[PDB]
Amino acid sequence: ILSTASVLAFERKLDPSDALMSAGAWAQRDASQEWPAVTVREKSVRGTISNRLKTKDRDPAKLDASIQSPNLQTVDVANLPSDADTLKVRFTLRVLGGAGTPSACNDAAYRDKLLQTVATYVNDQGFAELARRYAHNLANARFLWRNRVGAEAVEVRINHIRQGEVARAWRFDALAIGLRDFKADAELDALAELIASGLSGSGHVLLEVVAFARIGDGQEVFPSQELILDKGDKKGQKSKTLYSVRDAAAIHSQKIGNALRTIDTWYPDEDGLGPIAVEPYGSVTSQGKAYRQPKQKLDFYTLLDNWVLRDEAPAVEQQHYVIANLIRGGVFGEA
Amino acid sequence: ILSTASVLAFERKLDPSDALMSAGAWAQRDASQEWPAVTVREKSVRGTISNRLKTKDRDPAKLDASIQSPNLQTVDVANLPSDADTLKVRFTLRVLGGAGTPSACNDAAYRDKLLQTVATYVNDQGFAELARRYAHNLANARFLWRNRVGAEAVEVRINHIRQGEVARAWRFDALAIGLRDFKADAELDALAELIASGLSGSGHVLLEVVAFARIGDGQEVFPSQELILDKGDKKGQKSKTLYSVRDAAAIHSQKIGNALRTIDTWYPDEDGLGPIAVEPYGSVTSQGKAYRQPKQKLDFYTLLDNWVLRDEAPAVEQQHYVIANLIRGGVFGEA
Amino acid sequence: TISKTDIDCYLQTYVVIDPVSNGWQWGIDENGVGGALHHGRVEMVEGENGYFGLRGATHPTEKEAMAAALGYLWKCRQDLVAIARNDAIEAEKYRAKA
Amino acid sequence: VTDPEALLLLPRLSIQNANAISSPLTWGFPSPGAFTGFVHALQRRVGISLDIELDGVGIVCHRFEAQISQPAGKRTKVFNLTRNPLNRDGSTAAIVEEGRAHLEVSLLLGVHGDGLDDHPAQEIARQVQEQAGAMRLAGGSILPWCNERFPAPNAELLMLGGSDEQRRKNQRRLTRRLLPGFALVSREALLQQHLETLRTTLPEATTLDALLDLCRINFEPPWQVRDKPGWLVPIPAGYNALSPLYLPGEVRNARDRETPLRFVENLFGLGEWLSPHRVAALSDLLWYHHAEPDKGLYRWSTPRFV
Structure with missing residues (x-):
């Protein structure tokens, strides 16, 4: 599943x-x-x-x-x-x-699918x-x-x-x-x-x-x-x-x-403000505004979950964003 | 018995x-x-x-x-x-x-059989x-x-x-x-x-x-x-x-x-995942997994209980793992 | 067969829930009287940078500050838990008697 | 009773095994009857020769240590005991639990008489201290201060002041000297008015229950504890008669056969440990006796407190 x-x-x-x-x-x-x-x-x-x-x-x-x-x-x-x-x-x-290798991961089948997805990205576009x-x-x-x-x-x-x-x-x-x-x-x-x-x-x-x-x-x-x-x-x-x-x-x-x-010029809001920092729920602290809110389907989490679990690979811009978050690192995971 | x-x-x-x-x-x-x-x-x-x-x-x-x-x-x-x-x-x-001498052991017949087992190992393969x-x-x-x-x-x-x-x-x-x-x-x-x-x-x-x-x-x-x-x-x-x-x-x-x-490259899962640390129920906590689960007959306890008690010595890899656990130390034994 | 909330009945006198403007910060009363003014030997603690207040996170409601206090008492300080255990046993024997 | 002409200060007396059991319901600091009986024994032993009347004692308690212990898994305390000698057959005697406590009190004695004029003040202060050094204060020996930094001397303060500013000045000079303790007074008007408040709350209330209500720490629902004005301890404030007054050579096994015996019973009142500069006149806070023996009701308190 x-x-x-x-x-x-x-x-x-x-x-x-x-x-x-x-x-x-x-x-x-x-x-x-x-x-x-x-x-x-x-x-x-x-x-x-x-x-x-x-x-x-x-x-x-x-x-x-x-x-x-x-x-x-x-x-x-x-x-x-x-x-x-x-x-x-x-x-x-x-x-x-x-970049795609996690430092900790419970589900080994998820780790194999995530490594396969990141390797697919790198082979298609490094x-x-x-x-x-x-x-x-x-x-x-x-x-x-x-x-x-x-x-x-x-x-x-x-x-x-x-x-x-x-x-x-x-x-x-x-x-x-x-x-x-x-x-x-x-x-x-x-x-x-x-x-x-x-x-x-x-x-x-x-x-x-x-x-x-x-x-x-x-x-x-x-x-x-x-x-x-x-x-x-x-x-x-x-x-x-x-x-x-x-x-x-x-x-x-x-x-x-x-x-x-x-590097993130790919958020759904306007390109007149420029790039923001690659964060999940892509947020700038000075403006107090979270772009890539999860109501739109463009945060790190629904994009990564559509890409890895159910193979809905996003646009090349949004997967640049996802791999930029994997380079960024983090603690992604529920409780 | x-x-x-x-x-x-x-x-x-x-x-x-x-x-x-x-x-x-x-x-x-x-x-x-x-x-x-x-x-x-x-x-x-x-x-x-x-x-x-x-x-x-x-x-x-x-x-x-x-x-x-x-x-x-x-x-x-x-x-x-x-x-x-x-x-x-x-x-x-x-x-x-x-390595085979325990620091605390009740049953002296078990201690004698354990010391004889470890000494048989070291005489056979040091x-x-x-x-x-x-x-x-x-x-x-x-x-x-x-x-x-x-x-x-x-x-x-x-x-x-x-x-x-x-x-x-x-x-x-x-x-x-x-x-x-x-x-x-x-x-x-x-x-x-x-x-x-x-x-x-x-x-x-x-x-x-x-x-x-x-x-x-x-x-x-x-x-x-x-x-x-x-x-x-x-x-x-x-x-x-x-x-x-x-x-x-x-x-x-x-x-x-x-x-x-x-040093443990003998666990029953795939050895392309590399060596893990020698533990009873050999478990990496970062990957959240236990290799050498006790259902497969390859944890430290069923191997030791088959080697010492009923004299079913395992393969040389699993007894390398057993003696590596005795070198590792630990508090073994029930309540 | 003495349950956990009957032990909490006599363990709750060892906590103190001080009001701050943000929320409710629980603490530990070593004399077991809920942080009374005269008979109360409250436990104050030394933190990282000049922290001298109650051991306890500033919780939003008293229901959660008291619950974190009871959880701390159950995890770490088992002597006050043995005090509350013997109090609960004597209370059960009292209701068996009177 | 009568006002003190002078105010003698016995300094910090160290008592080593005082009676921690004040009464059948209270433990802790010994009863004020112990201190009033000690000052009457001081009068009886040295005051009848200096031609003065040592009457009234103010109790201060700089240091208190009870020989108690808190048992494991118990919230309450028990008493550390002494090992008595054996019986004549070699068995251990039946243990009678007595509480011992190490005190450090200083006493303010009301002195009035004609011997204030006939003698110097330091002479009668020295004489009552050298007589108190051979005495005991609640059953415990008065440790007589050998080979420390300096011995604590006395001061007999004549309460008759030439001016009110000089009187306030040397009340301050004495209060600074007996400062690290806490003066023990009697608040029975507070006990009665708390009984009256508890009776407007719920009818048929006894002042034993009002005394207990001043003793507890009550938790109140909206949680907060009910605050108290002061320390508010329970003290045994005297005795109440149980028997009629028996004649001297009539009761059996008395202390003396020349004093009328009467079986009595404690009368628990309310106390209040307050600091000695909250009184603003140290000629108050002195504990006297009040007998009224025709009714019973042998009791001590500090009248003229407020």
Whole structure:
């Protein structure tokens, strides 16, 4: 009858690291291996209230008394130095391969059918579209999240690392390569064939992705943000904590992985908003909206269940989405 | 009539220690005695929901409202340093000897028949296949569990430790020695004769096993995972802890021992699924299955109860499995 | 033949269901009086980052916080379960008598 | 009864095996009859020579440890006992369960008389403490403080103040000295008004049931426990007559044949353990006797509390 396996855990292909951000100057990007790290430091902020009032707090004497006792905070802040305008964000990406094989699966007949379905996909169309879009999200520095939104010039250098050194070095202009069109190129196709052979298992692919962003001297850079402890007084609050591995600001690894996954231009809603990150019930956190809702038949789960259990193979776009979720990994399964 | 002993406790032979993982750079593996440890640090994660819904939570307004409040965790994560591409997993292993003698056994006639049965095995065919497969699971770095799957180059160094120092030093290429074929070698057979002299009680064997793995600069290593307390909120949740002995990530000793016991290529299902760990009712919990189910006459208990009580010795593979369970240890016997 | 809910009858005095603004967070009263103000030795616990409150998840309803409390008491703390067992046995003998 | 002219403070006295069984219904801290009888024995032994009248005691209890144990699988407690000598035939004697408790109380004694003038204050304070060191307080020996950091001395506070600010000042000076404990008073008006409330709730109520209602922790449906004002313990507040008054040489096997004997029975009232700075006058909170022997009703309380 082939019901769904009760547990299905897929390991994560495309493992990035914590993206260490350091600083320096443009035209000395080629000597950027002794560049001093962007350090997370503290500063004390004070604001009046700016939030909406709920018609109980709109008394003018109460509003004046509320702005007379303001909230005093400390925030973790990371800036470039006042003699450095280029932010170097460096991580390493390891494309693993063996995407359809689960890390845990009860129903062995389901595992055989799922491996047969993914192998049917790879033989019909290998990881060529997916690797083209992953190579784009490396090529345009989408992993620079807010460090990219006002940068004068972004340049991404991607180095394929063999036995100990660079086997093949790419160098991209991340502002000519946009954040929304997965166009064709000559070097992006070479990087895409590399990531394609990595996802197929045909080779060890360890990339070193280094991105340089002309922001400006002293400007704020944006490492990934932690969550807070909140035990003491509201003056020493520590309202914002920033990530740092060892006295050096850093973006979390899964933030880089989410920006790499932003390949999904196939959702049923409009293409004017661009690609979203490949998630089951494909959801963007900022917009608060789950595209690929299960009411439409286009989430990861009804597509995977129609493809594997009852052989309703979707369109080539939706099965690109399904195999992108299998590359993404997860805990898919009931209780 | 020789009924089974109601208590039967075998002490564990092949005692490993906890596997201390430190980090550093390749091509100075030979100066890796002062390599800095891998430390288990915390990072914050936020994600939307990706698990399956149960047809009651498939309202689109409810799905959007649930992804507007995504779950906040902190997870223990262990990474290599950002200037180190090699993970050194180091433990020591003691091979004891006296495999058939139980540590607790009521029926002295059963204990006499069991010792005679095991001694008949060792006289007929010693610990020569078992030690060969244990030497393989040391030689291929199977104890590197998920630190091995994307590793560029793995090398295992096993040192026999006599009165104070290395009496005999091996060095293996753990990717040439596969994870599924127990082939033959000239150095693997010397390690097999050493583990055989340990398991037979003819000599004290203590091996210091070191395995290096080219992972990449700053990539994620995977120590063994603890279980958590679950006493508070769901934002500072601490949803994942990792094992560490003293500010230094580690794999549990029973995980290393479970990798070393993965010698069982004799289970009645298909051997193209590879070796499994030697357990009574031989079960991989990740695949949710029990090979050697008791209906087929091939679990540890019906084989032992036919070998000792009624003297129906099985084939040599199944008695290799039985003696591998006695080397494994366990609490056998009813109530 | 003393059932489980008759043991829960005397085990429920060992829990305390404190009201928070989100929901109901259960706890454990070591003196067995439901977290009384004077005679109540409530068990407070140390968590991850400065957590000093009741051991217990913030549940939406009291019916589920009390159920998680009883499940914790049945899984882990079997001395209070033996207290409630002997209380239930003495109650059954009392109704056999009076 | 009569107001104290001075207020003597015996400091923290360590009692090693005091009677934990206060009464047939209550255990714990010993009865206030023990302390009032101790202060009458202090009057009887040293007060008739200093020409003073030690009357009224305030009980503080800095430290309390009962020699109890909680048995396994039981919610309640039992008493740790002593092993008595054998019989004349060599068998173990029948065990009589007595509760022992290690106290650390400090007593405020009401002192009034003409001996306050004839003697210094520290002299009569030292004399009643050196007499109390050879005594016992609820059946337990008063540990006499050898070779610690310093011995706790006395202070006889003359309650006659020249000004009300000086009087409040040295009430504060004494309250700070007897602070880590909890003064034990008698709240019988609270017991009677709780009985009246319970009688408006349900008719035919006894104040034994109202006393129990102040003792329990009541669970209330919407669940919440019923809060209480204070600690509100049950104490034995004296005795009630069972027999008519027998003549001195008439009853058999009395203590002395010169005192009228009368079989009595406990009278359980309500107490309240409160801290000593909640009273704002330490010349209150002193436990006196009230006999009225023609009716029975031999009892102790602290009048002039509120």
